[PDB]
């Protein structure tokens, strides 16, 4: 996550002080400068799993084309649920199922 300038809404690029030895987020369109909280400047994931379970909506139980199972819900122990596979559509994607209860509407696995 990256922060924005509080006065002109531009991006806050990180900057390093030679004399003070501190990491600071500074806007290049002004003189505003705010002290950085964490040193994690950049992170790149070669193999990522985000978007696998992130594709979830709160009204997925109203879809009539989705199959319905009788798996046990971990939270409220309901007897009706709706399952589907991974929303990510790469070639390496697993065939595991995500179950959605019809009362608490949370996503849970079978393992």
């Amino acid at each position: 996550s990256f922060r924005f300038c509080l006065e002109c809404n531009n991006m806050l690029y990180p900057k390093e002080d030679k004399e003070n030895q501190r990491l600071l987020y500074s806007c290049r369109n002004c003189d505003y400068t705010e002290l950085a909280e964490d040193p994690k400047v950049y992170r790149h994931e070669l193999i990522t799993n985000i978007g696998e379970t992130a594709g979830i909506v709160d009204d997925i139980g109203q879809d009539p084309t989705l199959p319905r199972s009788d798996k046990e819900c971990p939270e409220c122990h309901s007897r009706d649920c709706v399952f589907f596979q991974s929303q990510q559509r790469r070639k390496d994607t697993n065939m595991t199922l995500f179950y959605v209860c019809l009362n608490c509407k949370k996503t849970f696995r079978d393992e």
Binding site: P64, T65, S69
Partner: protein, 175 residues
């Protein structure tokens, strides 16, 4: 082809909010509303809206060849009144849970008898069936969101010469 102005009037009447009053941070769960490919607004209760639009179309208030599509996965609600869309008719199954007729065809023997006679018991043809809500048209894009029984015998749950029908056991129940 049909004009899109009554569609916009109906949508604005039933709580659709325009784009100028839309904030993506605030509306992290609203549904985008498209009309003929034009993003015209947003809504936060798409279920009531799609139910109202479908009921209006089935009653003849909206033209029967208008497409009403709800993409739940992408949080979109699309409407098409364009010219050139290929459609076909289908029977309507009563899907209301609160109704007693759930899981059954809306068309009855009374409709068949009226069609055979040719008039209503206070001309009764195909259009009368379409505007009575027992038949409706669907195009290829709206077909992606519906669940179709092949025969009316499929709505209710060892011979070497008769063909074998699919079990469809992957789902515990079918609506």
């Amino acid at each position: 082809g049909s004009p899109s102005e009554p569609i916009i009037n109906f949508l604005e009447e039933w709580g659709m909010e325009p784009l100028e009053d839309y904030d993506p941070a605030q509306h992290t769960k609203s549904t985008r509303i498209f009309v003929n490919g034009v993003w015209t607004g947003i809504h936060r209760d798409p279920s009531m809206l799609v139910s109202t639009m479908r009921d209006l179309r089935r009653s003849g208030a909206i033209s029967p060849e208008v497409s009403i599509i709800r993409d739940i996965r992408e949080r979109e609600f699309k409407i098409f009144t364009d010219v050139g869309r290929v459609y076909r008719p289908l029977f309507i199954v009563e899907d209301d849970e609160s109704k007693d007729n759930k899981g059954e065809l809306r068309i009855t023997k009374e409709h068949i008898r009226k069609i055979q006679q040719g008039y209503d018991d206070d001309v009764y043809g195909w259009s009368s069936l379409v505007t009575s809500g027992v038949i409706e048209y669907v195009d290829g894009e709206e077909e992606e969101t519906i669940m179709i029984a092949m025969t009316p015998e499929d709505l209710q749950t060892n011979d070497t010469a008769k063909r074998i029908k699919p079990e469809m056991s992957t789902s515990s129940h079918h609506t």
